[PDB]
C-alpha cells in the first residue's frame, strides 16, 4: 500500500531529522534542566540551541521572550486570560476585537470571557474571504484591551493583513496578538514587522511533535501566568521542561525557515497543478481569494455532492484530506514538503474518478 | 565513566519499554486523532489502551475522567483556577485550605488567587513532618470551596493522611484535591478510597516523558476548562493530543503499578541500607518521620557542613542528588527501580569520604 497525505493543516509528519535530534533526550540525557548536577546542566546547551533556532524563526530579539508551551491552544488561552486579568479587570479595558475566522481555541476562550462580562466583537468575514484591516480601526473603542487576528486561516489558507493591523494597533495603543500557527513554514513570519505583542505557534504544523508550542512575548509586555509555579521560563510558565520536544521543535522551526523558498516555488507549484486539474470538472470552484493564500492549501467545492462523502471516498482510496466550512462543506487539501508530483497526479485521477462515481450515484 | 542517579523525585529515566512504545508514533502513525480519515482513526486503539492503563493505575471508574494534560503543574492550575471560577466567584465559597508542604505549582496558584481576594489558609507542618488530618476539619469554614493536600511530599518523602482527609471532606461537603505526583509508582493510589474529586499526576516521576500529565476528575464533578477550545478530551481540555506521550504515559503507569511490590521490598530495602550506612557518621540525622514515607526517599542533614556543598561534591564524583529545605538545607536522595546494591554501596563510600573531606576543610 501507498497512502497519500493531504491534511497538513490538520497536522504534519515529524521530520526524520527532528526525530533524530529528539532521540538522545528520550534515552540518556534525561535529567531535569532545573537540577544543579550534571544531568540538568548537561541539558543546557541543546536547550539554548533550540531556543536560538526558535528566535531566528520568528525574528524575535534577545530582549524578547519566546516561551515554550504545551500547544498553541495553551498559548491562546494564556493570551486571552492574561489580558483579561491585566487589562480588563484591573484597567477597565473591557473590550476585545477578533475575527470569526479564528481557531476555536481563541473563539471559545472569547466566549468564556464574555460569559464573565467581557465585551467581544467578532469581525465578520467579507466576500474576498478576509478582514478589511480597517474593521479593527472601526472597532477600537479605546476600552479595547486586545486585538487578536490569525496570521493565516486554517480552513481557506487565506493570509490576513497583519502588519497593517499592527500599525492600526500601534497608532491606537492597543495590545496585538496574532495566532500564527498556520503561518510557520508556509510564509515568512516577522514579529518586528508585525508589531506583535503576542504570537502563537504549534510545532505539529511544521514537522515537529504534537504537544508543544510557543508564545512570543514582546519585551516589557507583561502577561499574568496561565501556569503559576514560577520555576521555569523566567517565571512565566511553570512545569518541568519538555526537553525532547523543545529540541525537536527548534530543529523543526529551523527546517521550516530553510524550506521557505521550496514551499513557495515547489509545494506551491504542486498545489496550483492540483487546483487547475480539479477545476476542469463540472461546477467545482475554489472557495475564497486565490492570491493571498499560503502556498500549500486549496479548498474546493463540488456542486451538490457534499464534502464529507467525498472525503470518505478519498479515504477509501488511501488519500487523506479534511473538510472546510464554506457558504455544503468544502474539501480542504493541504500539501507539505513531502508530497510529490506523482502523488498529486494520482490524487487528481482519483478525485476525478470519485466525483464521477458520486455523479453516477446522483 | 559510570554515574549514579539519586534524584528521582526531581525526574526519572524514561523506561526503555516506554521509549519503545512511543517510537512508532514519532515515525509513521503521525495522524491527528481528531481527523476522520485513516491516520486519525489508526491512532484510536493505542490511545484507548493508554487511557485504560491510566484508569487502572489510579483505580478510576468508567464513569470518571482522567484528562490528559501537559504536566501536573497544568493540572494544579486547572484545579485551582477552575474552583475559583465555579465555586468561589459564582457560589461565594471564597475559602481554600491547603498545606505549606504543597508543591509551588499549588502554592503559587493559591497566592495568585489570594491576590484576587480569595482567602487561603495554609496548614502549618508539625514536628512529625505531617498534617494532623484534623487541621483541615478545624478550618473547613463551610465557605471552603476546596481542600488540597499532596499525597506524598517531594522533599521529605512523607505520606499525608489522604483517605482520612477524604472523609473529613465528604462529611463536610467540600471538594477534595490531591496532588499525587510523588505517589505514583511509590505506593498504591486509589481515588475511590481517597474520595478524591481531583487527582494530579506527572509522567516523568514514574519513567514516562516530561511534558505530560493527568487530572482525574470524578463523575458529575464539573470544572471550567483551563484550555478552552472544546475539541478534545470531552471538551474539558483542548489542544491536539500528544499521541506519543499519551501512549508512553500509559505504559509507564502500567509499569509503575507492576513494580509496587518491587518498590516496597527492594528499592525500599536499598534506601534503608543507604540510610543506616549514612547515620553511622557524626551528627547526621534523617529529617522527619521514618515510618510514613514512600520507599524511595531519604532526606539527611550533616552537622554544620551545608547541603549545597555536599551536593556539589557528590556531583564531582558523578553522583546526582538534590537539596531539601529542612529547619541549613538538607540532602535529598531518591532511588528508583534502576539503582543497584553496588551503586548504593559506592554512594555510601563516596558520601563518607566527601563528608570527611569537608570535615577536614572545617
Ligand atoms: Cl490566568
Ligand atoms: Cl480558567
From Swiss-Prot, chains A, B:
It is an enzyme of class 2 (transferase). Keywords: 2Fe-2S, Cytoplasm, Iron, Iron-sulfur, Metal-binding, Pyridoxal phosphate, Transferase. It comes from the Bacteria. Pyridoxal 5'-phosphate binds at residues 72-73, 154, 182, 202-204, 240. Its main location: cytoplasm. GO terms for biological process: [2Fe-2S] cluster assembly; cysteine metabolic process. Gene3D superfamilies: Aspartate Aminotransferase, domain 1, Type I PLP-dependent aspartate aminotransferase-like (Major domain). It catalyses: (sulfur carrier)-H + L-cysteine = (sulfur carrier)-SH + L-alanine. InterPro entries: Aminotrans_V_dom, Cys_deSase_IscS, Cys_deSase_NifS_proteobacteria, Cysteine_dSase, PyrdxlP-dep_Trfase, PyrdxlP-dep_Trfase_major, PyrdxlP-dep_Trfase_small. It is found in: Cytoplasm. The active site is at residue 327. The modification N6-(pyridoxal phosphate)lysine is found at residue 205. [2Fe-2S] cluster binds at residue 327. The keyword Cytoplasm applies. Pathway: Cofactor biosynthesis; iron-sulfur cluster biosynthesis. Master enzyme that delivers sulfur to a number of partners involved in Fe-S cluster assembly, tRNA modification or cofactor biosynthesis. Catalyzes the removal of elemental sulfur atoms from cysteine to produce alanine. Functions as a sulfur delivery protein for Fe-S cluster synthesis onto IscU, an Fe-S scaffold assembly protein, as well as other S acceptor proteins. Homodimer. Forms a heterotetramer with IscU, interacts with other sulfur acceptors. Belongs to the class-V pyridoxal-phosphate-dependent aminotransferase family. NifS/IscS subfamily. This is Cysteine desulfurase IscS. The gene is iscS.
Amino acid at each position: 500500500v501507498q497512502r497519500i497525505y493531504l491534511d497538513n493543516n490538520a497536522t504534519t509528519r515529524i521530520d526524520p531529522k527532528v526525530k533524530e535530534i529528539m532521540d538522545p533526550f528520550l534515552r540518556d540525557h534525561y535529567g531535569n534542566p532545573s537540577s544543579l548536577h550534571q544531568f540538568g546542566t548537561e541539558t543546557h546547551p541543546a536547550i539554548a540551541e533550540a531556543l536560538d533556532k526558535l528566535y531566528k524563526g520568528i525574528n524575535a530579539r534577545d530582549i524578547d521572550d519566546v516561551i515554550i508551551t504545551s500547544c498553541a491552544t495553551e498559548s491562546n488561552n494564556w493570551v486571552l486570560k492574561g489580558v483579561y486579568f491585566d487589562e480588563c479587570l484591573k484597567k477597565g479595558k473591557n473590550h476585545i476585537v477578533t475575527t470569526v475566522a479564528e481557531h476555536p481555541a481563541v473563539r471559545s476562550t472569547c466566549n468564556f470571557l464574555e460569559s464573565l462580562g467581557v465585551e467581544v466583537t467578532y469581525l465578520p468575514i467579507n466576500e474576498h474571504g478576509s478582514i478589511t484591516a480597517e474593521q479593527v480601526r472601526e472597532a477600537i473603542t479605546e476600552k479595547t484591551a486586545l486585538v487578536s487576528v490569525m496570521w493565516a486561516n486554517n480552513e481557506t489558507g487565506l493570509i490576513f493583513p497583519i502588519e497593517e493591523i499592527g500599525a492600526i494597533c500601534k497608532e491606537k495603543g492597543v495590545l496585538f496578538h496574532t495566532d500564527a500557527v498556520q503561518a510557520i513554514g508556509k510564509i515568512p513570519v516577522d514579529v518586528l514587522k508585525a508589531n506583535a505583542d503576542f504570537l502563537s505557534f504549534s510545532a505539529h504544523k511544521f514537522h515537529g511533535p504534537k504537544g508543544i508550542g510557543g508564545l512570543y512575548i514582546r519585551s516589557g509586555v507583561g502577561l499574568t501566568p496561565l501556569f503559576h509555579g514560577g520555576e521555569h521560563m523566567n517565571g512565566r510558565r511553570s512545569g518541568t521542561l519538555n526537553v525532547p520536544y523543545i529540541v525537536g521543535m527548534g530543529e523543526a522551526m529551523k527546517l521550516a525557515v530553510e524550506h521557505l523558498d521550496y514551499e513557495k516555488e515547489v509545494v506551491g507549484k504542486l498545489r496550483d497543478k492540483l487546483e487547475e486539474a480539479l477545476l476542469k470538472i463540472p461546477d467545482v470552484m475554489v472557495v475564497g481569494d486565490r492570491i493571498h493564500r499560503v502556498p500549500n492549501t486549496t479548498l474546493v467545492s463540488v456542486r451538490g455532492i457534499e464534502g464529507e462523502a467525498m472525503l470518505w471516498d478519498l479515504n477509501r482510496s488511501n488519500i487523506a484530506a479534511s473538510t472546510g466550512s464554506a457558504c455544503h462543506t468544502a474539501i480542504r487539501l493541504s500539501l507539505s514538503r513531502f508530497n510529490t508530483e506523482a502523488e498529486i497526479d494520482k490524487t487528481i485521477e482519483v478525485f476525478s474518478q470519485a466525483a464521477v462515481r458520486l455523479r453516477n450515484i446522483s
